[PDB]
């Protein structure tokens, strides 16, 4: 029952400062433009200790499966090869990605009937709001 309120199929409904976030991450122009249009469906499921987060969109389809606190390899939508660790902290999923001596943190929170994603890279934050599909 660890992630019960996160489980389901979610659709992206709003985004703020995502281009800048991507610039800070180091995403290039063409990828930024095309990824920025995307309205992904995020599908979160749990089976025993393994959480799966799928992202389905027009640009790229991504999928990660993981155990909380256990590092894994991830290829991101912008094609970074990163080392990822996802933990639960006070009911918030906290995802850190490490690559090329860089780091970014993505937090996912249930807020009212929405799932809010806040991505941070040094100073720059983006907020992505999903609603149930
Ligand atoms: O949750 C998110 O909505 C999300 C979605 C994407 C994303 C997903 C699908 C497409 Cl087609 C394009 C971009 C993403 O791409 C990594 C980047 F931002 F570095 F490009 N990062 C996040 C993040 F940072 F917040 F986890």
UniProtKB/Swiss-Prot annotation:
It is found in: Cytoplasm; Nucleus. InterPro entries: Calycin, Fatty_acid-bd, ILBP, Lipocln_cytosolic_FA-bd_dom. It comes from the Eukaryota. Its main location: cytoplasm. One of its GO terms (molecular function) is long-chain fatty acid transmembrane transporter activity. The modification Phosphotyrosine is found at residue 21. A motif (Nuclear localization signal) lies at residues 23-33. It holds the Pfam family Lipocalin. A fatty acid binds at residues 128-130. Monomer. Homodimer. Interacts with PPARG. Forms a beta-barrel structure that accommodates hydrophobic ligands in its interior. This is Fatty acid-binding protein, adipocyte. It comes from Homo sapiens. The lineage of its organism: Eukaryota, Metazoa, Chordata, Craniata, Vertebrata.
